[model samples]
Target: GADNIDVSFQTILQQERNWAGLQSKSLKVGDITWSYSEGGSSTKPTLLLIHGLAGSRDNWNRVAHYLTTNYHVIIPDLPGSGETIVSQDFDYSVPNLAEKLRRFVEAANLKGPIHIAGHSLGGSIALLYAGQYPFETKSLFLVDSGGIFRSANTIYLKDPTYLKQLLVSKKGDFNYLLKQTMFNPPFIPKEFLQAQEKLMINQAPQTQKLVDQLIALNKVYTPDSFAVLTKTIDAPTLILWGKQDKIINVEVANELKRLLKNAQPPVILENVGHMPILEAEQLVIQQYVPFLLKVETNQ
Candidate 1:
């Protein structure tokens, strides 16, 4: 009877996945094994979605169903996150992660060019993939992506409370993190919060490694670095940012728009935060669907 909470949490998660038409699957791609979810028709153009740092494929569950109607959506758990298992020494650099993403796509045998979208760290990986493999990219969608601009407003790197929130050290910290990441945090059940806390605890070492990587990334990926890296991405780009993003200030959106060769005007959602996919699910879909449809018809 005490385990009912755990089962209910997972059962609800599975129900949502089913409703989204996602099927859980795994693959052995190169040195890494990827645990991912796929949905929609094989005939539709593939849309590869990458979740942010310390996030799993479940991060996209809120929005994947809307996307699957018009596209073949695939969301993968990156190394050291979710069910994707990797060696402790796996490289967490953006370029290296992009390389692994390429291998995963290649191994999946997806036909035609891919429309890639990412949030936060995943955004940087999507951009790098487009830059490195322009031919394979059909379009790019970046939601509160990283590596484009350095914001002076975000003290997450230095502020002890903020840093601690990144990977909570103990109970009752998940609620605190939700406030930092969202403009209006949603109500998460205590059972679910506890489950999330347990997950963070179990993967503490791996999550810490990711946090270290982001800190290192922060120093290297200045606006000038993105200027060179994003030049080759000629694919049509849709940039969405939360106006109230505390983690990466909305000011960086302007820089991101300027750096991408063919990006549409950045759509800054007024009251959202870093997690746009979750916070403004419908807003993201309204823009994302039409953008992809236009891309599909035109190119």
Candidate 2:
């Protein structure tokens, strides 16, 4: 009976994806096999969604629902994260990861300028990609992005145990992570959370390894450098943030706006946190739909 509920939880997650118009797909990008979700019409402008650190393609499930109708949506697992597979020694630095995404884009055969949206660590990659390939990027979206902000509120910033807590050494750690990620953690069904706990528990070591690789870049990926890179991206950019974000200070949104030459005013959601893409999905869609539509028609 216990096993059945877990299966049901997994079933419901997949069901939502199908209902949202997403289909699971994979492609080889050199040594890594990138697993991603594809949806919407081919003729529509392509919108690439990138997830944050420790996040997967499934993180975009809710936001992708409203996007498929108007955008050709592609959500990749990203190496070391989601279903994407990589070798133990894969390079996970920001520039390397951004380069990998470029390869993924070419291998996937996406044409014309693409709209890119990313959260947290993914935002950093998207920012770099846009900078490096300005003509290829139509617009950019950053949701509570990392790399640009050096200040953080979580005690975990000072403690190594933080990663273990998030990776879940125990069942309670899942809920602890939720509280850290969201202003008011949404009510996930107990059974679903249970299944999620099991899933994360098993992947703890793998996730930890990837995270360590990223952390190793502390010297290379600096906020000042990202700030310098942000100045070069002339693409129309949308900045979104949760006012209550504990991870990256909300002030970074304003700073990001000031840095970007063409960024629209930042949209800060009340009562939300780091994961605005999930915590404030409807608001994200509401703001994103209009912004992209306007960018599309105007350009």
Candidate 3:
């Protein structure tokens, strides 16, 4: 099944970066250059996965590799995140992000109604994009997405204060943060922490800048930005949450679903927390496909 990819994360810096059979590609949307992974036959259904804050298209590395056999999988690095970086003058808010990605899709000529799966900030972006082009959107899978609260409690917002800590973070530092993200110690391989820690030193400055910008942009948004977008969304929507999520409370899952009239009831998982894609990879793997496939089958 190649199901336990945790072992893979512990070793290579690019754990399946060149995901099984996919191609790495990049295109410019004006000033912003977008990096992404694409594969699968055009004849197959399309599934576009968006990564969360500080994450790259590689965030969906194994997950996309797992699903490409069935669907045409495309995963993109969002603006100011991953491989897509913009100037300090750029906008990082939800609406701007969605619009940028929307143009990327149209320019790429990704066939209409492409299904979207987003995590954290990516979730809010997915919601905004789908709302803007409801007719062109297929379905949505928001995994522990942001936007339920006026502002998220994500610790990344405090990176300038603690990102330095992460640069020198020992094994305990990694575990402390990882534990908070999940109900228990992540099955994340020890080698992954070691590999990442060395890389962390080089990223502190960039991380500091990105976090500051997002923190500023993040505050300007409340539920209002996403509410206006999702309320008008006509696509089939699914909300996924980790009951143990400390970064974003599970309760918002209820508040969030209440707002999106088209979204089905939330799917809550226990012993899971903030990053389902990382901590509960298999469960996320198990949940998303059905949700993604179910909507199209019904349509």
Candidate 4:
């Protein structure tokens, strides 16, 4: 019976063809070269997916693939992250990154009023973008976003040992961090960790620099700084939160709901941790597909 299953990579790609066609394009905004993956069709509403800290566009592959059938999906590797590495002096602040994203969108001539979805840091950027370009954004989907939460210390920054480990540990150290961060550690394969470790090790020098920039920027332009901007955003919003997310607690979702009084009540995913896109792909698809379909049809 196991042999009857056609489980090759090609088979999977073909099966996912409706949503997974992949191509690359570059947008040169000043000196930065922003690389993005384009899929689905241009005729439909475009959905831009942004990934978290140290994450690449690949992080949204699973979700992007699923959503492509109904929307034109543009997944980008943020300037300082993923394959799009920036200069050593690059400023990794949220506002700076958001500006870069705005330029990228403008350069690409992405249709106005696009749907936007993002996770963690990416979520914060998406919210910032929606606020900055109110008329250009149609709907907002925030998955376990960071900006709405209280300024509590994160586990990595709070625990000295973890910080040391992150700063000095060897290649395999991610295994421990992943287990501690994810509710379903086994779902994240060792190969993924290995690949990520390689990238982290190679980017070690820039990591601290970027971290410092982020901290300094946050102190000056904290999430609360976006409060007025949030109020300006009248786009229909959807929040997807993971129940076991320790980094950005689930309570932040409730906080966002209060902030955006018109936002739909967040659909909470149980048994999932910070990385719900990886931990519960099928479950996310089940909910997201219907919501997107409704938006597509109504528009």
Whole-model lDDT per candidate: 0.84, 0.84, 0.72, 0.73
Least well predicted 10-residue stretch by lDDT in candidate 2: 152-161
Poorly placed runs, candidate 4 (over 4 Å): 1-19, 151-169, 186-192, 221-224
Q: Which model scores highest in TM-score?
A: 1
Measured over all alpha carbons after superposition, the RMSD of each candidate to the real structure, in angstroms, is 2.6, 2.6, 5.0, 4.4
Scored against the true structure, residue 46 in model 2 reaches a CA lDDT of: 98
Per-model clash counts, in order, read 0, 0, 0, 1
- Model 4 lowest lDDT segment of ten: 159-168
The estimated TM-scores of all candidates read: 0.93, 0.92, 0.81, 0.85
Poorly placed runs, candidate 3 (over 4 Å): 1-15, 18-20, 85-89, 148-176, 184-186, 198-201
Ranking by TM-score: 1, 2, 4, 3
In angstroms, give how far residue 103 of model 4 lies from its true place. Answer: 0.5
Q: lDDT at 179 for candidate 1?
A: 80
lDDT of 1 by residue, 1-299 (tens): 66554376667767878988898899998779899999999888899999987788988988898988778999999987888988779887777889999999989998678999999889988988999999999999999987645443677633324554667667776677778789955567777888877776777787777777766776666667778888778999999999999888888788788888899999999989999898988899999999999999998
For 1-299, candidate 2 gives per-residue lDDT tens digits of 66653357667778978987999998988899999999999999999999987778888988999999888999999876767888877777677889999999999999789999999888988998999999999999999987645554555443334555567656787888888789956668887788877777766766787567666665455678777888889999999999998777788888788889999999999999999777889999999999999999989
Worst 10 residues of 1 by lDDT: 157-166
